[PDB]
């Protein structure tokens, strides 16, 4: 029997079990996968033979993600500066200038009482306490309804909302408003800092730094999906798709949180988790890496289309590049290549498409969705909850973080917290 | 005798004379110069012939100053835009862009932040209850001081502290924070419309406003500087420099807050106002217009300089134009034409001098300052009293607005409170 088992080898189960591991304790790590690093996912384009991609989580910043630049200095991973963006063709009006900002004049002093208000609302979240702690409902409403209240000018608006789909994965009318603001508040309350944290990227790929992590774990079991986690006994059984149980004193559940639903605990998990848990978050971010002819490097494109963002990813060729575009698999079906071809063309009229590579997230058993985003309602009536103990049961990953979630770095800060709850534990 | 004396001729001595003739009362203006129009003053230039200049309020918005708005349109007062800038010399470093919003991306999260912190700030103050009745005192230090806690980059810190020297007419470390916030509350709490104000002008000068108001007042003495004013019997009595006196059921006193100390009062005025108006504010702006060669059109410059500021205000000729220059009469001798080329050179290095023009504000009995601003440490103690009627006398003027002081508006404004006060009047 184990110390403890950690279910999931996202960065999240990654982190506990090595730290567990260093730490003395005896450790098991179950992924229900063929590979480690979950929703980090470095591979081979299906595009472009031979050329390496992310199609899940890629972009980091340092300095609001600690943890992993510690990660990164700790095994030497190389990182690299994301591509600059140098040429902007929006679809934000007539009005709009073509840079990173593309805010006129004419509408500064709109910006001005927009930065205050925002701000001002996102300064009521205390990242520690929960969402669901802090007298927040009147802001947990729909992120279309709560705009419509800042009065702002076309360019502004839209540009607002085009990042808001794009970093939410969710249309403005199934956003949450709080949530917005819980991105803002997680980015030491700055709305800029929600864009500017795209700063760096893994120069080999995400999986440079999965592969360095796992290093350290000594008994991983690929392929081994959790059924049933059961501490009703003086030890947890933890039961497995098509194979042996196995027996732990302490259970991690590194895996996500749309995926909790699947799995049997017995004792049944506190009442308030269950609906939402039932129910899923509303996140359904969608990236779709665009192979193109005819693109000039380092564009930029932000504005009203069915792509919200679209913006160079990588050099291919001299002729040839990827971009990335995000918009939400709710509005956009990437199987429909004439839709992908319009939604370009609006921004590029001149580029040709010449294929595309996603994974389809919420599609994928092991996943059930992208990166977290709750829906309207949910998160002010239980938040905080979700990420804490059921007496040997901890829930950890980016999706339940209160810090950074949706982010690599709230996976790890959870996995902090659990360790740190097992080390000082009494039983 | 009269019902009303206004002693001075300015926009709030000659609203209100006006006003309350229309309203039947029997009034007479007593002014001490040998013009209407105080510190707005339209004149030829002492610099190019035939060429008219305001030498010094000039500069009006129509959203912002809805009381002028009115007199312009009540008169048919043509305005034109004030002239747009259209070249960028800066001195504020090498990071600088040269546009009118300088700051560069590098510095955005600062300044992100400092707009929070400077509209929550400004939020604090309600423009209707004084400035010593807030608990505003925390705020009311030297604005370098202020400043420093905002801990802002080089370019938007001087960028700030230039406009602030600028508009308060005081160098950092004499000016309030306080006071720069009530500025910023003034113009519907916007740091950027404090500059956007700066909007249009008089298509003929003030003296344009100045005239057809004062066709209105029936009775108007020049010439007739007040010495006195005593409301010790049942009827004021005015007494005047070299001149028999003159009586009244009420006086307004339209004459610049600096100069109420040269009148005696009967009784002696309330006690709390005594000493800040023995005192005076501590408004030292000084406005330079500057006949130069060799400058381009549209030139905005601002940095670090010993002229905050220095901006384009009209076209002589091909080769010609007035710049006009802020700074305060603490920190500049405009008689040391050595400096002013020093000065103006830091910013535009080809152009030269030829001709400066200004009025000494300070210097001049009739007004002994510019606008006001409070010196550190006074409006938190007394600010709406200073405007308040002692008994039958009342206290109007730009200077001791709560509304818009040290604007033209403010002196609209003023003059319809004592207005409604005199006709609601019970005595
Ligand atoms: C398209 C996309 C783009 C993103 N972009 C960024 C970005 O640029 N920057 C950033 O910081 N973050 C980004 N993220 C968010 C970030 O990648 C994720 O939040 C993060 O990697 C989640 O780590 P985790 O350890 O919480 O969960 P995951 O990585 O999801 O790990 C969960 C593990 O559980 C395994 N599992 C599931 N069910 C079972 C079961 N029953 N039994 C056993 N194992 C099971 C899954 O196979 C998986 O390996 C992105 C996410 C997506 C989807
Ligand atoms: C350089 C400068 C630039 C400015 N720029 C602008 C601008 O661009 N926009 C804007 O809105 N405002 C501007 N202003 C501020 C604005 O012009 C003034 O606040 C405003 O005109 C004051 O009007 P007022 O009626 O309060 O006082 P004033 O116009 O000062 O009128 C006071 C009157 O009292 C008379 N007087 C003094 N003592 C006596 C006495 N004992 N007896 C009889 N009469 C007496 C004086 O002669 C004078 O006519 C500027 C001011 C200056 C000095
Ligand atoms: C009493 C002290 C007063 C201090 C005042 C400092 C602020 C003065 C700003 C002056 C002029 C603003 C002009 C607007 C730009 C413009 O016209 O020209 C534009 C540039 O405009 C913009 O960048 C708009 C974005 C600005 C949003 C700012 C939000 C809050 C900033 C508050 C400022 C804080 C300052 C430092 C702490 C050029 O192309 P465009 O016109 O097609 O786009
Ligand atoms: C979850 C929703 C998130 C919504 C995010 C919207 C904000 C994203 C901004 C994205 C990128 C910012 C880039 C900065 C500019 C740059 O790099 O390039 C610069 C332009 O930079 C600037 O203009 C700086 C002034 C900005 C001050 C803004 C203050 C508050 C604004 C808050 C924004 C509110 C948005 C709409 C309501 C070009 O020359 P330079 O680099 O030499 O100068
Ligand atoms: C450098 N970051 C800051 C904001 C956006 C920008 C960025 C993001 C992604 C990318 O590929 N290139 C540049
Ligand atoms: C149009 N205003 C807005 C801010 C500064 C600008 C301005 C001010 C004075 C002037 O002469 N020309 C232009
Ligand atoms: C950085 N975030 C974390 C979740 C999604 C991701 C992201 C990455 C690039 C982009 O343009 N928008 C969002
Ligand atoms: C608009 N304000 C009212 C008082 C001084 C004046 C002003 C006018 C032009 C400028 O650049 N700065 C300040």
């Not at 709080?178 to 080999?204: C, K, P, R, T």
């Not at 103990?389 to 999706?399: E, K, L």
Request: aromatic content about 8%; hydrophobic content about 40%.
């Amino acid at each position: 029997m184990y110390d403890a088992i950690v279910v999931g080898g996202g960065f999240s189960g990654l982190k506990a079990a090595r730290d567990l591991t260093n730490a003395g304790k005896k450790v098991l790590l179950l992924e229900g996968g063929e590979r480690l690093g979950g929703r980090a996912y470095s591979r081979e384009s299906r595009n472009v033979p031979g050329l390496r991609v992310e199609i899940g989580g890629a972009y980091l910043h340092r300095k609001h993600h600690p943890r992993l630049a510690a990660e990164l200095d700790r095994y030497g991973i190389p990182t690299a500066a994301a591509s600059e963006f140098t040429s902007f063709r929006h679809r934000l009006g007539p009005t709009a200038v073509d840079q990173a900002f593309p805010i006129p004049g004419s509408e500064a002093v709109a910006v001005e009482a927009a930065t205050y208000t925002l701000l001002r609302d996102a300064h009521r979240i205390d990242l520690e306490k929960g969402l669901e702690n802090q007298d927040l409902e009147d802001l947990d409403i729909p992120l279309n309804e709560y705009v419509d209240k800042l009065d702002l000018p076309p360019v502004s608006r839209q540009f607002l909302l085009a990042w808001a789909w794009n970093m939410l994965g969710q249309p403005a009318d199934q956003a949450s408003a709080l949530w917005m603001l819980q991105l803002v508040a997680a980015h030491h309350y700055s709305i800029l800092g929600v864009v500017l944290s795209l700063d760096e990227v893994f120069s080999n790929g995400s999986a440079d730094l999965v592969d360095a992590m796992s290093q350290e774990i000594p008994e991983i079991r690929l392929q081994t999906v959790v059924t049933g986690i059961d501490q009703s006994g003086d030890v947890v059984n933890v039961t497995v798709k098509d194979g042996h149980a196995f027996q732990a004193h302490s259970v991690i559940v590194a895996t996500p949180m749309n995926t909790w639903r699947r799995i049997v605990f017995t004792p049944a998990l506190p009442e308030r988790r269950r609906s939402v848990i039932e129910e899923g978050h509303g996140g359904q971010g969608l990236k779709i890496l665009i192979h193109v002819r005819g693109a000039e490097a380092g564009i930029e494109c932000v504005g009203d289309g069915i792509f919200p963002t679209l913006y160079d990813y990588c050099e291919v060729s001299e002729s040839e590049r990827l971009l990335v575009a995000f918009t939400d698999s709710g509005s956009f079906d990437p199987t429909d290549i004439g839709a992908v071809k319009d939604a370009v063309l609006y921004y590029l009229p001149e580029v040709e498409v010449l294929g595309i590579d996603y994974h389809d997230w919420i599609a994928d058993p092991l996943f059930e969705g992208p990166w977290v985003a709750p829906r309207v309602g949910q998160f002010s009536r239980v938040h905080k909850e979700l990420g804490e103990p059921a007496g040997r049961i901890h829930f950890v990953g980016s999706d339940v973080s209160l810090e950074f979630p949706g982010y690599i770095e709230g996976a790890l800060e959870t996995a902090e917290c659990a360790v740190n709850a097992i080390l000082h534990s009494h039983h």
